[PDB]
Design a binder for this molecule. Structure first.
Ligand SMILES: Cc1cc2nc3c(=O)[nH]c(=O)nc-3n(C[C@H](O)[C@H](O)[C@H](O)COP(=O)(O)O)c2cc1C
Ligand SMILES: Cc1cc2nc3c(=O)[nH]c(=O)nc-3n(C[C@H](O)[C@H](O)[C@H](O)COP(=O)(O)O)c2cc1C
Ligand SMILES: O=C(O)c1cccc(CCc2c(C(=O)O)[nH]c(=O)[nH]c2=O)c1
Ligand SMILES: O=C(O)c1cccc(CCc2c(C(=O)O)[nH]c(=O)[nH]c2=O)c1
Lengths: 313, 313
């Protein structure tokens, strides 16, 4: 029985990795994720300049998942580029670098500088499109023309295979439109579904108060709340983007949750909230649990079941 | 006690009602809701003509909620109109009729017929903006120009105060645009937030299969999965629509959940999945539990806390 994967010209011991934003902001974090039994890691979404992010409390977790409005706190692109170029031990596992510029121009500037390092060290780009552009306009991936512009500009500036981190969608028309945009861009080799379910609101009954300070308490949802939404998006894009990989993210707490992602179409499986809550020991548990389901079903490899969710009649 | 309230020129014993679609399709279902302890009832969303809906299984529930692709099965507008005109006992509680035509013209045709009944009997209209997927275009409430058309045309045709059933939004710019549309229409006196979270996908690990037959397993999510989404939409519209009422729907299983909806801004609180799962006895329990939380906090009225969720700093 094996969890090994080969994609994007890299080898991966197993499909599990952190989700961007979790356990990946500092050099300490990235060393920790490297030391863990995950098959890969991704660095925190970065901007050109370092950011403090939003005031605290800006993350909170609960039995059914988490809410956050972190505000993109990060150490700045130069830091993550140096990590990828000089610090990361690529003999341990592959590295993804997540970028999330606040304008197309900022993204272009970063990718131009990433490219030689991607070429020479093999660091892989994850471009976060589930992010803000202009206040009063929707996030980029919810604005299809903006999304097309970002991908045209980053494809030209980078010129190397990359992937994109997508928000969840809720309307089949959006699945159709979004996947068609992505399919215009041959350098988009993987699609990560999904980022948080946007602008939820958690209220504490006792205090009668929201639980995060930014945005009057509104923030992105992760965790148990979002698994079916995550699965739908993985499968929607898996069906619609046959020449790309899909990575799954959302609601993974167990090997069974990972198995469901993989049946939906996931290649890599990212872990956000559950990793935030449990710490990097989760990876050995998820590995064991996934191998146990495979053994019971007689599956020897991931490809024997990836994308093989059955439909009814 | 007591949880009695007045809205929309009607008196309600308590703020609870079924969510459209649950326990409200047949005359039997409507008489069952009327006999319950709910403060109101709403009928199944109807078309001009009867519909069988989609193939079974088309609804499934789980510990965290439900998924459905019912396909708008209903007995047709003439049936619900006759129920409102002739069979409903308005001495028991108010009745809302939900309408979900597949075009503007079909809604206009139904609402012109409903108007005299509304005048004579006081039946209330909930206009459902969600609809079956049509390839090439989004649902009506995710197309702000189509939504504006629908409300212009229904406003003109109906001429009386009515409400609208909204899908969830996930983006602050969308809240701003949708609320601005709604505020163009003075006859829209209530907004019901939210319909199911669209196009989720539940997979059964043992069978390696989706759990509903239509749409390759994709369907709307309700229950525990969607409470924070529902609260955010309730509050977003409560803040943006000061001259309207907001009705909360999504994730209510307990009086605590109702309390959170009301803190967010809800006037009425609708119950879908938990009603489907527990049956109409749930209303006595929700009432008792809400009144118990009120008493422990010192609240004598719903108005003392409606909309009074606290923010940080
Ligand atoms: C604290 C926190 C920080 C996050 N920061 C990022 C980020 O910087 N870039 C991004 O692509 N996603 C970010 N996310 C989203 C996660 O990557 C992930 O898509 C989402 O949490 C869903 O997965 P989950 O259900 O495992 O949490 C963040 C999530 C959390 C909880
Ligand atoms: C079986 C079923 C049928 C539904 N049919 C309708 C409908 O006809 N019209 C409507 O506006 N919403 C309909 N809904 C959505 C619910 O009214 C409600 O918005 C949703 O289930 C979220 O509430 P909950 O979390 O309490 O389930 C239906 C929901 C279910 C589960
Ligand atoms: O700066 C923000 O307001 C903001 C809001 C939503 C998303 C982002 C991008 C970074 C990010 C964050 C974050 O840093 O808030 N949180 C998530 O759950 N996913 C993400 O992609 C930034
Ligand atoms: O026929 C459908 O695929 C469909 C999809 C979404 C919405 C509707 C309208 C009726 C409805 C249904 C339904 O009857 O399937 N289910 C819900 O959760 N909300 C609803 O508003 C019908």
């Amino acid at each position: 029985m094996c969890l090994k994967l080969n994609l994007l010209d890299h080898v991966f011991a197993n499909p599990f990795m952190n989700a961007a934003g979790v356990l990946c902001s500092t050099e300490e974090d990235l060393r920790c994720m490297t030391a863990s039994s995950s098959g890969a890691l991704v660095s925190k979404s970065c901007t050109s300049a370092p950011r403090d992010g939003n005031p605290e409390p800006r993350y909170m977790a609960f039995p059914l998942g988490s809410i956050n409005s972190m505000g993109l706190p990060n150490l700045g692109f130069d830091f993550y580029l140096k990590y990828a170029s000089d610090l990361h031990d690529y003999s341990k596992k592959p590295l993804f670098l997540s970028i999330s510029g606040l304008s197309v121009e900022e993204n272009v500037a970063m990718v131009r500088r990433l490219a030689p390092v991607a070429q020479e060290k093999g660091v892989l780009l994850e471009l976060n499109l589930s992010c803000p552009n202009v206040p009063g306009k929707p996030q980029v991936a919810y604005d299809f023309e903006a999304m097309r512009t970002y991908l045209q500009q980053v494809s030209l500036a980078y010129g190397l295979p990359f992937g994109v981190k997508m928000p969840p969608y809720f309307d089949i028309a959006h699945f159709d439109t979004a996947a068609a945009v992505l399919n215009e861009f041959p350098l988009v080799k993987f699609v990560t579904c999904v980022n948080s379910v946007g602008n939820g609101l958690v209220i504490d009954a006792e205090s009668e108060s929201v639980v995060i300070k930014p945005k009057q308490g509104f923030g992105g949802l992760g965790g148990k709340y979002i698994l079916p939404t995550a699965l739908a998006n993985v499968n929607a894009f898996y069906r619609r983007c046959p020449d790309k990989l899909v990575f799954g993210c959302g609601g993974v707490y167990s090997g069974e949750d990972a198995f469901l992602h993989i049946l939906a179409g996931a290649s890599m499986v990212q872990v956000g909230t559950a990793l935030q809550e449990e710490g990097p020991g989760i990876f050995t548990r998820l590995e064991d649990e996934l191998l146990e389901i495979m053994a019971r079903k007689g599956y020897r490899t991931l490809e024997e079941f990836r994308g093989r969710v059955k439909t009814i009649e």
